[PDB]
Amino acid sequence: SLINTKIKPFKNQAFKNGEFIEVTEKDTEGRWSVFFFYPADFTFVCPTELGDVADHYEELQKLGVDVYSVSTDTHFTHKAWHSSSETIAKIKYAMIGDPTGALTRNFDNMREDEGLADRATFVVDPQGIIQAIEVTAEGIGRDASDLLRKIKAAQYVAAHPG
C-alpha cells in the first residue's frame, strides 16, 4: 500500500491561529507529521474527532509532532468554521485546504464520486516515510489516544532498530 513510502510534493494554503499560511513537503522535512484527513467542514457530524486531536495537541507539540488536518474545503472555509463550532475553535494546528484534491490524491484518499477525502490519518517520520495508516468508514471514530500511542512507538522504533 502507501505504507513505508515517502510522501509526494505538495503546495497548499491553510489556516492556523487566525492567519493564512502556506504548506509544502518542505515543512514536513526533518519533522514528524500527522496528516488528519476528514470529509467536510460545516456538516452535522460531531466535530469530535478533530477535537480529540486538539485536546492532545499540547502533548503532541511536546513530542515534536506537527498536525495538519485536511479536507477538500478551501482554507477560507476552515477559517469561518474555526469561528463557528466551539470545538473547532480549540484547534491550534494548521488546517489545510485541498480544493484541487491533489494532496488528498497523493495519499490515495479521495472518494472520487464525492469530491471529498476519506477519514484517514497518516503518520510521516522525519525522512518522509509513511509509518502508520488508518482509514475508517463514516461513523467509525478514530482514537486520538491510540494515535499518540503509535506516534510514541514509531519514534522508539526509529531509535531502537531491530
Q: Which of residues 23-62 bind a copy of itself (CB under 8 A)?
A: 40-45
Q: Cβ of residue 64: shortest distance to a copy of itself, in angstroms?
A: 17
User: How many chain residues bind a copy of itself (CB under 8 A)?
Assistant: 61
Which residue out of 4, 26, 29, 46 is catalytically annotated?
46
- Our CA dihedral for 110, 115, 118, 121, rounded to 10 degrees, sits at 70
User: Catalytic annotation on 46?
Assistant: yes
Q: Cβ of residue 79: shortest distance to a copy of itself, in angstroms?
A: 7
Contact flag: residue 99 with a copy of itself (CB under 8 A) = yes
Q: Which segment (47-55, 56-64, 72-80, 88-96) binds a copy of itself by CB under 8 A?
A: 72-80
Nearest 5°: CA angle at 67, between 100 and 128? 75
Residues that bind a copy of itself (CB under 8 A): 1-4, 40-45, 72-74, 76-77, 79-81, 84, 98-101, 107-109, 111-116, 118-120, 123, 129-141, 143, 145-146, 149-150, 153-154, 156-157, 160-162
Known catalytic residues?
A: 46
